[PDB]
Design a protein around this ligand. Sequence first.
Ligand code: K
Ligand code: K
Ligand code: K
Ligand code: K
Lengths: 445, 444, 445, 445
Amino acid sequence: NDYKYIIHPKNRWYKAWEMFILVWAIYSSLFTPMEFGFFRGLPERLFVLDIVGQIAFLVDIVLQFFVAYRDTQTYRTVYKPTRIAFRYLKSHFLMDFIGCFPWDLIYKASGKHELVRYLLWIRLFRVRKVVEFFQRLEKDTRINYLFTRILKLLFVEVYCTHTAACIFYYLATTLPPENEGYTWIGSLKLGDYSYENFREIDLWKRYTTALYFAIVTMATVGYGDIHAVNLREMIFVMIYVSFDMVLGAYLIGNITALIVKGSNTERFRDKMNDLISFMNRKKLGRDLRSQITGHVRLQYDSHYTDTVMLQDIPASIRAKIAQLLYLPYIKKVPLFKGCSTEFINQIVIRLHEEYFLPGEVITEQGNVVDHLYFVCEGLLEALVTLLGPHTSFGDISIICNISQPFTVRVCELCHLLRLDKQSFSNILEIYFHDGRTILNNIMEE
Amino acid sequence: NDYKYIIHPKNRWYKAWEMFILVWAIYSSLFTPMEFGFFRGLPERLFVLDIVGQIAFLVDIVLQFFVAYRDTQTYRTVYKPTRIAFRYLKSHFLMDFIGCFPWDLIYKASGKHELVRYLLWIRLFRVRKVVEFFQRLEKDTRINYLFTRILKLLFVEVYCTHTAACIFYYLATTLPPENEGYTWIGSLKLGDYSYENFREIDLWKRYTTALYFAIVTMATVGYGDIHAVNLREMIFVMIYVSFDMVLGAYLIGNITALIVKGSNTERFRDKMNDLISFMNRKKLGRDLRSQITGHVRLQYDSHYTDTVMLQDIPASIRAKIAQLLYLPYIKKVPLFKGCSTEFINQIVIRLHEEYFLPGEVITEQGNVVDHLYFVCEGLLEALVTLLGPHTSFGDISIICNISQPFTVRVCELCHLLRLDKQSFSNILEIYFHDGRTILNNIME
Amino acid sequence: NDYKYIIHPKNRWYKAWEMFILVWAIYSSLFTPMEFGFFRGLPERLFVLDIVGQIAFLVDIVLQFFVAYRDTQTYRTVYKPTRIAFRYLKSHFLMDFIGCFPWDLIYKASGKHELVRYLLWIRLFRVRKVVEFFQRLEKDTRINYLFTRILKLLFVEVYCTHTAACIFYYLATTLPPENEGYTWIGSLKLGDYSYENFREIDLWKRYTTALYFAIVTMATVGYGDIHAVNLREMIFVMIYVSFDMVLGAYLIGNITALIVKGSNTERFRDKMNDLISFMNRKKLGRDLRSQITGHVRLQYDSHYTDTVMLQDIPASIRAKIAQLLYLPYIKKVPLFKGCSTEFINQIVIRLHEEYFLPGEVITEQGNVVDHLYFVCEGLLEALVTLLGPHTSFGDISIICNISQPFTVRVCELCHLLRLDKQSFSNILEIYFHDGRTILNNIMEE
Amino acid sequence: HNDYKYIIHPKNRWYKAWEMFILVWAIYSSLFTPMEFGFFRGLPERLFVLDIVGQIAFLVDIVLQFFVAYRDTQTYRTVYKPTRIAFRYLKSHFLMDFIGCFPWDLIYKASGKHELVRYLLWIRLFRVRKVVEFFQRLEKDTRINYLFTRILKLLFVEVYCTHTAACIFYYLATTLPPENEGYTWIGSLKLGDYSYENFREIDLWKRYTTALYFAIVTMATVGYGDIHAVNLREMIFVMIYVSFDMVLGAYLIGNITALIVKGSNTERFRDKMNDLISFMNRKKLGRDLRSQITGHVRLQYDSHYTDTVMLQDIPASIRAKIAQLLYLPYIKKVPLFKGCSTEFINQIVIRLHEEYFLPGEVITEQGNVVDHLYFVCEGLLEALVTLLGPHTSFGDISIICNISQPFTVRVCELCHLLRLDKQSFSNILEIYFHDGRTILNNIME
Ligand SMILES: [K+]
Ligand SMILES: [K+]
Ligand SMILES: [K+]
Ligand SMILES: [K+]
């Protein structure tokens, strides 16, 4: 569908309108409980700030009419400007068009009725754009999805305790200024400071005092210097600490569910509490068992080469991992100069990757060779000549019946491509002109 | 069906009676601690409410000598009259019959003794009609096990604080009204309000103060504006906060066991997170990386494909899978159709339903054949074919065993159906009748 | 055995004494902090109770030289009465002998020095008895074992607050009685009661006040009506809430571990979760989706066959449990069972435990028959023919090899055993004259 | 690669009394530093030389890091080179370690007493590296427990963050002048009959214990409310602090939970045993056969988990001799494996799996093609004909000529039997048909 206005929502200019209008949706939903609770009609040095705030969201409900709804199941950017304009208009339109009115001028214009000031809470449907941000961030593999299920709750508490702080102050102002000794704040004395005549206290002292109660209540510390006094602040504190009691168990739940999918050090000790067993009873040479612990400290703390995981995708396309990365490592070898792709593919059917810390001897001198080795990383030592990367060893003695003439020792941290020497008999006897290719580069010394 | 004055327990009138004594059992067990704690004899403008409250639970005792039950080990609904009158009468008769007696007129017409009034607590045995609700909601997939052990723990933790509010008020009234200053509420002063002469404060101020000190204690906030000053109140809030320590730990434990025991995203994100952590170890581009992003919706999509299949194997309901959606989807393919009952029930087994994201590469040209696909959903594009439903591909690559002659790429999220090729060569050449029935009709 | 007077530790007279000294070890370890904290040397009225409290532990001293030691390595009853005198004199002898001295008479006969009263805390090692009781309770597998770790944490939690109440009261008594206004209890005023001259407040008011502080501190409520005043009470409350912070996280952890390894209804409702999301996309049934969970509530939540856990035990001894239970149910079955030991041992592995709910039909007349079902108990209906226990059906499907002539309906939830037709092909052909001997009396009676 | 003389090897036993010497200087002067900032404005003269000798212990440690060969994590080399260990130090921890060693109390007292030259004391808290480079060397040490290192670096973080929150909370009371002192948390404090007025001349340890008492009661979320925040700058600190340790207490509960729901192998076995015992105790099987399954499924159970973990771990070129030291003296005393070469037994030892079985269980029967081929390590088995003792072999003629195995296996004492597939053995006798001819002759002789 051509439709040369309809923004596909990966456009880079529809991302200076999703982290622009997300900053506005954080301001406009952190300020709206403060505008409801701590003011009755905004002071007129906040008139431009309340006018231009609702313009940025007003030119955002025209940019929902020209945006590409990628469909719910049949994945398709539905470019049709009568089904994006009718998907929006009955999902969230009049919770974005209602909370865009100048509810502070409607309040003051209509004779200052208090009930027309409760429609500020329709502007809390802009934290939607912060929960359509912790949903487009768990769909991002560079961090854990369950870590974002903790960071979602740690914005939720901290938005519920700012909103609770702003409703708890508001409930003090619903009694007349002469009945303020029967409120939580007009009857407060902290230190030598009396919070009498609290409506003329500085805004940030009143906000910080109301937020102090709500945070030491959310944490369930609850000192009791600030407490409910009324019968209507008791009902709010009862609702709020019942909401927190569930919300604080949910936080502990998510942190525990993160930790039960544990870390690599306790996964190392998971693989090693049993490797104290079996080798105490049926013990090996504890020099080589110390290097076994070394190779477990090398599979852990380092590369998790996923031969433990590549069984998920099928064998011919996990041999395609052995195609688009192994045509580098196998064609780079000077032993296979002049070898066609089929021999390469049948060799990389049966390849393995192992790693070697310095200290081993890999193919021992004076004894039979067991495997093919190609060098990816690190650097080796043959004792006489130093055999580095993209090179062959173990391989000058399986083409004939010879032994390994070098104590091929490992000097840097290596990345051996190890293959069974059974394979370099079957692949070598089925393909004959390939066998003579290896024969003539053997005679190319 | 032998007696006809028994009631089948799923009769749709006796499901609108059980929802009628569930709003009385919620009322009469929330009201009963307020009948005990906050009054000494119920007032005169509450007489007709206390009478007609205990009538609804009195035509529930004559209506349960008539109700058929389904046995616990015999597992058949029992309709025997002189057997239901000995199951009800062994379990729930007297705790239903005692708490019906008019214990406010029995209190008042016996010279107002206080011990005739602790028999109101027999009516808290009516909360069993609320645990019989959250225990029949348990067994409901229709209404999720999204939160049942954890909602019935949030009812029992606002029912035990409504009751503790009423016992905590009642212990204030056991000291005479001249020892009010040695009481949690007679010595209370909140703001400029003094709760003195506290028996003459209106009921909802007393009740809301007592509930404030049950909920602030249950949440373990514990401000300290209201606290126990007495020895009997000290003993009560010791018992209560021990019970709450255990109950709050149990609530936290149930929520974290619901969150630990995760299924759907705990088979999905743990795939691609580790897989991109391995492909950013050794770089694999994006085309095959997106194709393996499609592959984690080939081995995880469609109910984890062939792992949950292998449980309803004693019950012969794989006939329904094997002829009710697979063989319709098979009769939705051209030659693969198989077109004969034996062969189609033979190849109906080894299939895999496969979800591919758009933009993907499905089968390249010059590529060795490896799998066979039945398309029923999605839309595919070949590089020559605008593939909608059931015009599926991979047909002429198997007998003419050469590379697939087309490069198909998908444009909207598709739902392929996979068989292995080595199946449909072996039982291909086994069925020579269907061998001819396959290789006669090639698209002319 | 060979040594005469050595009581074996599993008698019925050293198990009435192990529970007699469990109520002297629950008394004398709950009373020992009350004797330390609340008295400066017991009253004369509490004299004989102390002496008989200590005399019941001298009897338990000498009855450890006469108890047969159950060894820890050799796993036997070491009757050697110098192998049971030793390990006692190396384990528990002295600390159960410096807790039997009369430390309230050898405190008052020494000038009443208050440092010999800290030898009362040697009597607190008699909660060995209470934790030994919770060690021979995990062995009792009749009740759960993580549940027996959350009652070994609600004894340890309400014993560490009884002790912390007595230490907290004790710390108020370490200041002189004229500096009592600088203690937590001498400066206490609850309601209109003043706790001044607190040493003459009677013992249960003082104890209940101290214990109320310790319990609302354990629960982390902390009203702060009673709080620490001194520096020594600050240090104690700091130690105690820090200790009780890891003891309360341990309780939550042990509760979670029990709930995670837990219920069989949420082991049933997640199976049916993706099964109903399965059948809402795979479309097996419209109301037999009830007959799906009519069988996920028949074989599951009840009749819990752990046959996948019988896959864990060996096939040999799984055939042996099939012998020892199945074959008395297998043999009381009609004539088409085989009437010989070889046949029933050759078929007994193949039969699967099945149940069926009433109102269900099994196999309609006029189809190929795939299985044979044999009733152990239960009531079946062939249609007009009532088949109770020992009245197994599935006879006429292979005997006179025509179609089945009945419709087996279920009249009571039964105990069928289902072998497949491959069983009554293999075992019926290798023993063929047994099958024709079965045919020799097919309802000829 | 020890070509560099004066470089200290990083595991030397004398540079390990300088990792446990500067860890007791790093524990002292990371605990003393918030006390030096918080409770003093410039140290007294009494604490002079303790200051000076505190910083010439971390000054010796600066030039003892240019002489220590670090060990790489990409080449895994101890880089013994002064030009290569210096530029690692100078770009990781040098400005956090050099200017944390300046005398920031002579730069305070001698720069005219400007505060803000005293906030540079806070970069001596970058010596808790040495305590988290300790809990990262204790956690790659399975020699020590995981209940001693896993929550124990959270019962350091929760007594380091409440020692430091106790010193900032006191410090904020000193930022108000000593006239506006009853508007602080401590100058307006009155506990008991003691008033903390004129608080700057209270002893250091009363002032420190009061602040730590607040901080620990707040960390535990008791919150008595006898000490609370009265300022607005102390309200903000308490709001930051109780929000920080609401996350940190949930992390402690999560760690203690995930250390319990990963309960070890013993209680996994007890779970196994209670469900196994109960499953045939509610149907009431014989206790003798339940004890038979006990005596068998137990060696079978531990054999199962240890054999699968020894096979799936230990990658190739090191697994081979482990398996050979497991198996070859037990399979070379074998009349079937005689005469063949050594590379064949190198291939054999990997595909071997040991097992454990009972005196009385059977492996295969009369009607049977085997699932495996077996050789003997332990056992007293029988073929029903041949009473096979130790160092024996069975399943051999069913390999080559594909005939059914006529002998039921009767094991008479607890064995150590050797699992090898028929499929893999046929695969490697396809490979070693040079040895396969000896195997055909070995079954035929
Ligand atoms: K408090
Ligand atoms: K708390
Ligand atoms: K609290
Ligand atoms: K509190």
